[PDB]
Enzyme design. Structure first.
Site, short mmCIF file in Angstrom:
data_model
loop_
_atom_site.label_atom_id
_atom_site.label_comp_id
_atom_site.label_asym_id
_atom_site.label_seq_id
_atom_site.Cartn_x
_atom_site.Cartn_y
_atom_site.Cartn_z
N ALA A 182 0.83 -1.21 0.00
CA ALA A 182 0.00 0.00 0.00
C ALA A 182 0.86 1.26 0.00
O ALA A 182 0.66 2.17 -0.81
CB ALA A 182 -0.96 0.00 1.20
N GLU A 190 9.28 -7.79 -0.02
CA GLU A 190 9.37 -8.58 -1.24
C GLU A 190 9.58 -7.61 -2.39
O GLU A 190 9.34 -6.41 -2.24
CB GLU A 190 8.14 -9.47 -1.46
CG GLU A 190 7.49 -9.35 -2.83
CD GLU A 190 6.13 -8.74 -2.75
OE1 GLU A 190 5.63 -8.60 -1.62
OE2 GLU A 190 5.54 -8.40 -3.77
N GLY A 200 1.33 -7.22 6.52
CA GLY A 200 2.37 -7.64 7.43
C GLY A 200 3.58 -6.73 7.40
O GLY A 200 4.23 -6.52 8.42
N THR A 240 -6.84 -8.00 1.75
CA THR A 240 -6.22 -9.22 1.27
C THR A 240 -6.06 -10.28 2.34
O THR A 240 -5.69 -11.41 2.01
CB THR A 240 -4.83 -8.92 0.67
OG1 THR A 240 -3.96 -8.44 1.70
CG2 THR A 240 -4.93 -7.89 -0.45
N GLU A 298 -6.26 -8.75 9.24
CA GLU A 298 -5.93 -7.32 9.21
C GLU A 298 -6.30 -6.60 10.50
O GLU A 298 -5.51 -5.75 10.95
CB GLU A 298 -6.58 -6.69 7.99
CG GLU A 298 -5.79 -7.08 6.77
CD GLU A 298 -6.32 -6.45 5.53
OE1 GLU A 298 -6.85 -5.32 5.64
OE2 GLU A 298 -6.14 -7.04 4.43
N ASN A 327 -10.16 2.59 3.36
CA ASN A 327 -10.35 2.15 1.98
C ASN A 327 -11.83 2.01 1.65
O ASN A 327 -12.22 2.17 0.49
CB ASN A 327 -9.62 0.82 1.74
CG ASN A 327 -8.27 1.01 1.11
OD1 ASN A 327 -7.95 2.11 0.69
ND2 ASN A 327 -7.47 -0.06 1.03
N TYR A 354 -6.96 -0.60 -7.05
CA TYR A 354 -5.96 0.17 -6.31
C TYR A 354 -5.58 1.42 -7.09
O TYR A 354 -5.33 2.48 -6.50
CB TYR A 354 -4.72 -0.69 -6.02
CG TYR A 354 -4.89 -1.76 -4.94
CD1 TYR A 354 -5.59 -1.51 -3.75
CD2 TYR A 354 -4.33 -3.03 -5.12
CE1 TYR A 354 -5.73 -2.51 -2.76
CE2 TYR A 354 -4.48 -4.04 -4.14
CZ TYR A 354 -5.17 -3.76 -2.97
OH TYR A 354 -5.28 -4.75 -2.01
N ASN A 361 -5.76 5.06 -5.52
CA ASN A 361 -4.51 5.72 -5.19
C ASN A 361 -4.41 7.09 -5.84
O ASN A 361 -3.79 7.99 -5.25
CB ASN A 361 -3.31 4.85 -5.57
CG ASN A 361 -3.21 3.62 -4.68
OD1 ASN A 361 -3.87 3.58 -3.64
ND2 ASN A 361 -2.37 2.66 -5.04
N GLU A 391 4.16 22.57 12.67
CA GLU A 391 2.89 23.29 12.64
C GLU A 391 1.69 22.36 12.49
O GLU A 391 0.59 22.75 12.89
CB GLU A 391 2.90 24.32 11.50
CG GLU A 391 1.90 25.43 11.67
CD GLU A 391 2.15 26.58 10.71
OE1 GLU A 391 3.36 26.83 10.41
OE2 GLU A 391 1.17 27.26 10.30
N1 LIG Z 1 -5.40 2.80 -0.76
C1 LIG Z 1 -4.58 1.79 -1.04
N2 LIG Z 1 -4.52 0.71 -0.18
C2 LIG Z 1 -3.69 -0.33 -0.46
C3 LIG Z 1 -2.89 -0.31 -1.59
N3 LIG Z 1 -2.18 -1.46 -1.61
C4 LIG Z 1 -2.50 -2.19 -0.52
N4 LIG Z 1 -3.44 -1.50 0.20
C5 LIG Z 1 -4.06 -1.94 1.46
O1 LIG Z 1 -3.09 -2.53 2.30
C6 LIG Z 1 -3.62 -3.66 2.97
C7 LIG Z 1 -2.56 -4.75 3.04
O2 LIG Z 1 -1.31 -4.16 3.31
P1 LIG Z 1 -0.16 -4.10 2.19
O3 LIG Z 1 0.51 -2.74 2.21
O4 LIG Z 1 -0.73 -4.39 0.82
O5 LIG Z 1 0.89 -5.24 2.63
P2 LIG Z 1 2.46 -4.91 2.75
O6 LIG Z 1 2.64 -3.53 3.34
O7 LIG Z 1 3.16 -5.04 1.42
O8 LIG Z 1 3.01 -6.00 3.80
P3 LIG Z 1 3.13 -7.55 3.38
O9 LIG Z 1 2.20 -8.36 4.25
O10 LIG Z 1 4.55 -8.02 3.58
O11 LIG Z 1 2.75 -7.72 1.93
C8 LIG Z 1 -4.85 -4.10 2.20
O12 LIG Z 1 -5.95 -4.21 3.08
C9 LIG Z 1 -5.11 -3.01 1.19
O13 LIG Z 1 -6.40 -2.48 1.36
C10 LIG Z 1 -2.95 0.78 -2.45
O14 LIG Z 1 -2.25 0.81 -3.46
N5 LIG Z 1 -3.80 1.83 -2.17
C1 LIG Z 2 -10.30 -15.94 4.46
O1 LIG Z 2 -9.53 -14.86 4.00
C2 LIG Z 2 -8.51 -15.20 3.10
C3 LIG Z 2 -8.40 -16.50 2.62
C4 LIG Z 2 -7.39 -16.82 1.72
C5 LIG Z 2 -6.50 -15.84 1.31
N1 LIG Z 2 -5.42 -16.14 0.40
C6 LIG Z 2 -4.07 -15.88 0.84
C7 LIG Z 2 -5.59 -16.86 -0.82
N2 LIG Z 2 -4.58 -17.55 -1.31
C8 LIG Z 2 -4.74 -18.21 -2.45
CL1 LIG Z 2 -3.34 -19.14 -3.00
N3 LIG Z 2 -5.85 -18.17 -3.15
C9 LIG Z 2 -6.90 -17.44 -2.68
C10 LIG Z 2 -8.15 -17.31 -3.32
C11 LIG Z 2 -9.05 -16.51 -2.64
S1 LIG Z 2 -8.25 -15.94 -1.19
C12 LIG Z 2 -6.77 -16.77 -1.50
C13 LIG Z 2 -6.62 -14.54 1.78
C14 LIG Z 2 -7.62 -14.22 2.68
MG LIG Z 3 3.93 -6.56 -0.34
#
Ligand SMILES: Nc1nc2c(ncn2[C@@H]2O[C@H](COP(=O)(O)OP(=O)(O)OP(=O)(O)O)[C@@H](O)[C@H]2O)c(=O)[nH]1
Ligand SMILES: COc1ccc(N(C)c2nc(Cl)nc3ccsc23)cc1
Ligand SMILES: [Mg+2]
Ligand SMILES: Nc1ncnc2c1ncn2[C@@H]1O[C@H](COP(=O)(O)OP(=O)(O)CP(=O)(O)O)[C@@H](O)[C@H]1O
Ligand SMILES: Nc1nc2c(ncn2[C@@H]2O[C@H](COP(=O)(O)OP(=O)(O)O)[C@@H](O)[C@H]2O)c(=O)[nH]1
Ligand SMILES: [Ca+2]
Ligand SMILES: [Mg+2]
EC number: 3.6.5.-
Lengths: 437, 310, 427, 53
Positions: A12, A71, A144, A179, A183, A206, A224, A228, A254
């Site tokens: 994000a 990553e 994470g 995702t 969360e 969001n 996204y 964004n 400020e």
């Molecule tokens: N507004 C906005 N939210 C985002 C975006 N990308 C990810 N998010 C939010 O970020 C949340 C997940 O955190 P991420 O920032 O994607 O994960 P990360 O910071 O890369 O940490 P990792 O777990 O290692 O992947 C999700 O619930 C998304 O809603 C973005 O481009 N714009």
């Molecule tokens: C219950 O909440 C969640 C359940 C699963 C996931 N993740 C990591 C997934 N990983 C793969 Cl491989 N495929 C799919 C398809 C749909 S989600 C998903 C994320 C959130």
């Molecule tokens: Mg990431």
């Protein structure tokens, strides 16, 4: 002139950082190669835009920014994207194994391995600063990396830059585009550990951005990218005072002074107007009174909540475009009569107003229409605590069964950190309650 | 099929509303804590408004207006009437004051009826010492020394009106009201039928109107109800900007009980607004069925209500 | 983020071979390892499952294992058999005789180091190994006994990698020997402790689907494996293709498993199709959604209405309205909310991928962590005790050095698993 | 309603309006991060020890 360094953490944070820096270049006339025709200060200058850009002897304007992810996937797109020449390669820091949606993997397991490298790359940018003001940190609550690595970095920034302000732009989790199912855990864990190290944090829910894109931009299912670009417009409104000439919110100090009288209640609500689809052939341009009135509609807030049922501690209006002070005060006077704007009795009932005459810039081919005048309102209202309530509830449902806690304990976190973080949040909701009734 | 949850089990009104919803075969009741509801019949205190309207795929409606307590607590109502320019410091509210047990020096300007209530008394001290022996906040207000008294019996009464405000902020006055009759004298001065002429000490409007034509030469509509509709409209229009859910992510409706006292000049006064009222047993079926039609089915799809137009 | 794939025993290698046929076709790789592909979505994450070789060939990161050479010869004779790296065929000669004890303790032990040597070579070339996926049956000797032996040894050497399995449960309706419940119960005991995620592929359900829904009078293992390959393709979608999610095995584990031992998934697929016969009307997103949640589409013979979904992962493949996908997925949860535990908010996550599987314009794959999976283990537990109470057929096992006590522990652990699943069905 | 602090420049102006007046150390961080690594190492040593049985 004092410099600001932007730090973008996780998916994000990085993807939002790209949107913002693209918009910053368009606003300042900086091309993707980093050249700025209008800077006659070649190789330097103490101009306002130099708060966010350094300059090479060769005339290149380079963001005072670092992108960090655990990553490489997302930052690799920056390395090969439109503005790849903009950033120095040392500014783009990548791991190989991400945090797996796990705060404890970002903060303890993987984070402890890369924190020293990140702080050395940050130290390199600080060393080109003649007077560093502080940091702008972009990240998600839910990722994470966004949650766990960010809080580790915030602790170290407090140690290594004790006197420097730290502001946050933070993405609050929404089920429509989230995702991970954990969360809520990561959000409370990163809020608890970070709360003391942050001076001002602008939360973006969001859910709010998504609905604004559906309602006002007629996007059936926002991506996204849609979110964004809208978010980068709001961020640009907030940081414009740092990058342009003016006398309101000219340094990070400020922002606290004007928006945060009490330190733990440091999450100002952002409200933005007008959001108009680029697809509307015929749009009647909105007046000062209409865009200002729109600042009190929950539908235009970055976090859906009801300020009529909280109290205000501060309120700023940041206009861009064809706006003169008289229209603002005329608009405020009538809005005072017609709306529920209650201040805490130990703060004056007033608005700090900034106007920049340059109307908002829009990304060519984006979804936002060009408009003649826009406004971002930043109010510190206790109503934003509704979002803490929602999140603490979801946290409580899962944690009551300890669902998923083993993934965190398995990374070296202790169960007690969950309840300690949850207790801090309990004190926070109570703070907002005492200030708001 | 629409879904709903019940979070106040002690509500007669919405217990009947639940029974009615189920019996359409189109509503199913979820568990209290299930958040995937369309309808919340919420608890009476600390109702969690900040958790409504954040459920994607669900239009959410609740049977309370956040902020309507300002009208429905004794000391906030006085604050609202005296401070809101809409209700000036107002011909139809008895003179009132808030006093705290840990300022109304106009009885001296009376220089002479001085009955007041919390509880009733004729001397300032007799009351003031009653509020301190309790502990919390009380309010004291002029007693209506010449009420209208029904004959036979010389009795005293108050009028309850039920008013339903829908999610669109239409104000609906239920056409059936009820008079609560009475047969240190709390026996025939405090008219609560909780505290036997007509069944249960309740005269409904048909009899009361017949009375007003026989004894006085007027009707319920002209002599009292115009005033009541005016009072209801004034109170709810005044707080509308603070509590409306027109542009909110969740919507509200609420049922109110307005309590009026009629004096001897056939002149109406507002005593209380009750935000979780009950109904007369004769009228439950009709009124609850009205709540479904006007407030619930209008969101999730002749009239027993008078729409008060604003 | 590389995955190492291992297929073991007769069933493991047959469903393993089908999986590599199916996803190779989806990624535009032919039996020679060359890419003649239409879209570029096909190659972006191709390294998760494929090593690249000089001359721009793509070689599966796959290791083929058996104590008997026969079905691995058939794989190499098979269509894509030439795509596998020949060094990654590791086999013995004596077979396992459908005996978990031989695969785990006597025959399999002789061969397991050679397999671990091949695993090591593939892992050392990985930039960042995610973990492993194993295809095997639980009813034979090799996939079941030696497969779980391999899992235990792989865990010792790679304790911070993810272990994922596709495990085929035995059924009397599709049965080779009477001792399958013994082999399965000993294996489940291993799976409970040593995998992070296992897809329960129930031969009972595969048979019922072919017979009842697909109107195939006499289903073969070929008909069963068509279902298996479609399910394997679907559940891998978010590992293999770019999307809004960019999933990997650890994130799947973190988001699907609230308590470590409850990591056994019911897979589901829609539309259900038989091999060779194609139907020409695509489903509507509303149809896909209803079929994917229907008990008749579950690959594990359990009634979902007898339990609760802890977590669900759903993947929709094909060109469709993601708005309609979102509405239909929200619809099923809001209309059936009692079947989703209230203490895991938003426990359903949906992903969409543009590329559909071969032969379908649209498909939906379902991954459920349901407390109804306990029915599967109860069924196996009854069949186990029916024989075990008379110690029937035990000599096949005590003859390899096993003790009755080991059977008692494995049965008791599987009963505990059933209890734990029951604990959360009522919360 | 009082206007104050008006500042004008060629890019814009700012001002204020009052409707109404009022009525951890680097070492402690090192300790917690290393504690968590010890819990991870302990639990992994329990796993391998159990796999050795
Ligand atoms: N507004 C906005 N939210 C985002 C975006 N990308 C990810 N998010 C939010 O970020 C949340 C997940 O955190 P991420 O920032 O994607 O994960 P990360 O910071 O890369 O940490 P990792 O777990 O290692 O992947 C999700 O619930 C998304 O809603 C973005 O481009 N714009
Ligand atoms: C219950 O909440 C969640 C359940 C699963 C996931 N993740 C990591 C997934 N990983 C793969 Cl491989 N495929 C799919 C398809 C749909 S989600 C998903 C994320 C959130
Ligand atoms: Mg990431
Ligand atoms: N100013 C006044 N003049 C005359 N009678 C009055 C009065 N104020 C109240 N009363 C009478 O005395 C009673 C005191 O009861 P109070 O008004 O406190 O009960 P309530 O109306 O809150 C109970 P419920 O919530 O069940 O309706 C009133 O119901 C009314 O009959
Ligand atoms: N679905 C399916 N199941 C199979 C197949 N081959 C074997 N099985 C199952 O696996 C069990 C036999 O174990 P098997 O793998 O052949 O023994 P192994 O050679 O030692 O691994 C039987 O109960 C079958 O139901 C197949 O091709 N498809
Ligand atoms: Ca310069
Ligand atoms: Mg066989």
């Amino acid at each position: 002139m004092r410099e600001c360094i932007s730090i973008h953490v996780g998916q994000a944070g990085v993807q939002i950082g790209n949107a913002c820096w693209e918009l910053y270049c368009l606003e300042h006339g900086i091309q993707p190669d980093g050249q700025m025709p209008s800077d006659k200060t070649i190789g330097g200058g103490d101009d306002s835009f130099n708060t966010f850009f350094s300059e090479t002897g060769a005339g290149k304007h380079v963001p005072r920014a670092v992108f960090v992810d655990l990553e490489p996937t997302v930052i690799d797109e920056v390395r090969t994207g439109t503005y790849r020449q903009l950033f120095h390669p040392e500014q783009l820091i990548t791991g190989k194994e991400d945090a797996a949606n796990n705060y404890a993997r970002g903060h303890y397991t993987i984070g402890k391995e890369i924190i020293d490298l990140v702080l050395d790359r940050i130290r390199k940018l600080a060393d080109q600063c003649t007077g560093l003001q502080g940091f702008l940190v972009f990240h998600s609550f839910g990722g994470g990396t966004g949650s766990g690595f960010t809080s580790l970095l915030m602790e170290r920034l407090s140690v290594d830059y004790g006197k420097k302000s730290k502001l946050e732009f933070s993405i609050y989790p929404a089920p429509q585009v989230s995702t991970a199912v954990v969360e809520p855990y990561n959000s409370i864990l990163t809020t608890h550990t970070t709360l003391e190290h942050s001076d001002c944090a602008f939360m973006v829910d969001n859910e709010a951005i998504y609905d604004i894109c559906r309602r006002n931009l007629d996007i059936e299912r926002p991506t996204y990218t849609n979110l964004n670009r809208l978010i980068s417009q709001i961020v640009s409104s907030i940081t414009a005072s740092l990058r342009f000439d003016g006398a309101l919110n000219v340094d990070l100090t400020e922002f606290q002074t004007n928006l945060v009288p009490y330190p733990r209640i440091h999450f100002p609500l952002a409200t933005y107007a007008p959001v108009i689809s680029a697809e509307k052939a015929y749009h009647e341009q909105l007046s000062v009174a209409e865009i200002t009135n729109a600042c009190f509609e929950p539908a235009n807030q970055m976090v859906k909540c009801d300020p009529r049922h909280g109290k205000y501690m501060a309120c700023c209006l940041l206009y861009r475009g064809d706006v003169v002070p008289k229209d603002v005060n005329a608009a405020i006077a009538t809005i005072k009569t017609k709306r529920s704007i209650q201040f805490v009795d130990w703060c004056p009932t007033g608005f700090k107003v900034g106007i920049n005459y340059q109307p908002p810039t829009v990304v060519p081919g984006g979804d936002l229409a060009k408009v003649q005048r826009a406004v971002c309102m930043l109010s510190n209202t206790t109503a934003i605590a509704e979002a803490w309530a929602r999140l603490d509830h979801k946290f409580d449902l899962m944690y009551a069964k300890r669902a998923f806690v083993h993934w965190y304990v398995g990374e070296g976190m202790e169960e007690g950190e969950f309840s300690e973080a949850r207790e801090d949040m309990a004190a926070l909701e109570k703070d907002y309650e005492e200030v708001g009734v | 099929m629409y879904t709903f949850v019940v979070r106040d089990e002690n509500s007669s009104v919405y217990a009947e509303v639940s029974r009615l919803l189920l019996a359409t075969g189109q509503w199913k009741r979820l568990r209290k804590d299930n958040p995937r509801f369309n309808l919340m019949l919420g608890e009476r205190n600390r109702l969690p408004f900040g958790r409504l309207g954040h459920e994607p795929g669900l239009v959410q409606l609740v049977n309370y207006y956040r902020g309507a307590d300002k009208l429905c607590r004794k000391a906030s109502l006085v604050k609202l009437i005296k401070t809101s320019p809409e209700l000036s410091e107002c011909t139809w509210f008895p003179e009132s004051y808030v006093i705290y047990p840990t300022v109304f020096l106009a009885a001296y300007n009376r220089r002479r009826g001085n009955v007041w209530i919390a509880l009733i008394s004729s001397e300032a001290s007799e009351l003031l010492d009653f509020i301190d022996e309790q502990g919390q906040v009380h309010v004291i207000q002029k007693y209506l020394e010449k009420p209208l008294l029904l004959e036979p019996g010389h009795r005293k009464f108050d009028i309850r009106s039920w008013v339903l405000v829908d999610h669109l902020y239409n104000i609906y006055l239920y056409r059936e009201g009820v008079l609560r009759t009475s047969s240190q004298d709390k026996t025939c001065h405090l008219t609560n039928h909780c505290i036997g002429y007509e069944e249960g000490n309740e005269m409904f409007f048909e009899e009361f109107n017949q009375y007003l034509m026989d004894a006085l030469n007027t009707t319920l509509e002209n002599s009292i109800l115009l005033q009541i509709k005016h009072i209801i409209r004034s109170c709810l229009m005044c707080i509308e900007p603070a509590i409306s859910t027109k542009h909110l992510h969740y919507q509200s409706f609420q049922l109110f009980g307005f309590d009026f006292m009629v004096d001897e000049e056939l002149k109406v006064w507002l005593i209380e607004v009750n935000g979780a009222p009950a109904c007369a047993q004769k009228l439950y079926a009709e009124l609850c069925q009205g709540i479904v039609d006007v407030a619930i089915s209008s969101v999730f799809p002749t009239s027993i209500f008078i729409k008060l137009h604003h | 983020r590389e995955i190492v794939h291992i297929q073991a025993g007769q069933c493991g290698n047959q469903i393993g071979a089908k999986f590599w046929e199916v996803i190779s076709d989806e990624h535009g790789i032919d039996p020679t390892g060359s890419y003649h592909g239409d879209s570029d979505l096909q190659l972006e994450r191709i390294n998760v499952y494929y090593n690249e070789a000089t001359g721009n060939k793509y070689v599966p990161r796959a290791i083929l294992v058996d104590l008997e050479p026969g079905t691995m010869d058939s794989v190499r004779s098979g269509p894509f058999g030439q795509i596998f790296r020949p060094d990654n065929f590791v086999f013995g000669q004596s077979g396992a005789g459908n005996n978990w004890a031989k695969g785990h303790y006597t025959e399999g032990a002789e061969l397991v180091d050679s397999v671990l040597d091949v695993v090591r070579k593939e892992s050392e070339s990985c930039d960042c190994l995610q973990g492993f996926q194993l295809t095997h049956s639980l009813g034979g000797g090799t996939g079941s006994g030696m497969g779980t032996l391999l899992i235990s040894k792989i865990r010792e050497e790679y304790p911070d990698r993810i272990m994922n399995t596709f495990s085929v449960m035995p059924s009397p309706k599709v049965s080779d020997t009477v001792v399958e419940p013994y082999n399965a119960t000993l294996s489940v005991h291993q799976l409970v402790e040593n995998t992070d995620e296992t897809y329960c592929i129930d031969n009972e359900a595969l048979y019922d689907i072919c017979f009842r829904t697909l109107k195939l009078t006499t289903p073969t293992y070929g008909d069963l494996n068509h279902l298996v390959s479609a399910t394997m393709s679907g559940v891998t979608t978010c590992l293999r293709f770019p999307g809004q999610l960019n999933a990997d095995l650890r994130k799947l584990a973190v988001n699907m498993v609230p308590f470590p031992r409850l990591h056994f998934f019911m897979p589901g697929f829609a539309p259900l199709t038989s091999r060779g016969s194609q139907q020409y009307r695509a489903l509507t997103v509303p149809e896909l959604t209803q079929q994917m949640f229907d008990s008749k589409n579950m690959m594990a013979a359990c009634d979902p209405r007898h339990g609760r979904y802890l977590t669900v992962a759903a993947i929709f493949r094909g060109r469709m309205s993601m708005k309609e996908v979102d509405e239909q997925m929200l619809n099923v949860q809001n209309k059936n909310s009692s079947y989703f535990v209230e203490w895991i908010p938003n426990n359903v996550k949906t992903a969409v991928c543009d590329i559909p599987p071969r032969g379908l314009k649209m498909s939906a794959t379902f991954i459920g962590n349901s407390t109804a999976i306990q029915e599967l283990f109860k069924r196996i537990s009854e069949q186990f005790t029916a024989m075990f109470r008379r110690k029937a057929f035990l000599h096949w096992y005590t003859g390899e050095g096993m003790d009755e006590m080991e059977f008692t522990e494995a049965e008791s652990n599987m009963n505990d698993l059933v209890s734990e699943y029951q604990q959360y069905q009522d919360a | 309603m009082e206007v104050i602090e008006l500042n004008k420049c060629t890019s814009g102006q700012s001002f204020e309006v009052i409707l109404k007046p009022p009525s951890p150390s680097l070492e402690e961080i090192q300790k917690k991060l290393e504690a968590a690594e010890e819990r991870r190492k302990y639990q992994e040593a329990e796993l391998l020890k159990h796999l050795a049985e």
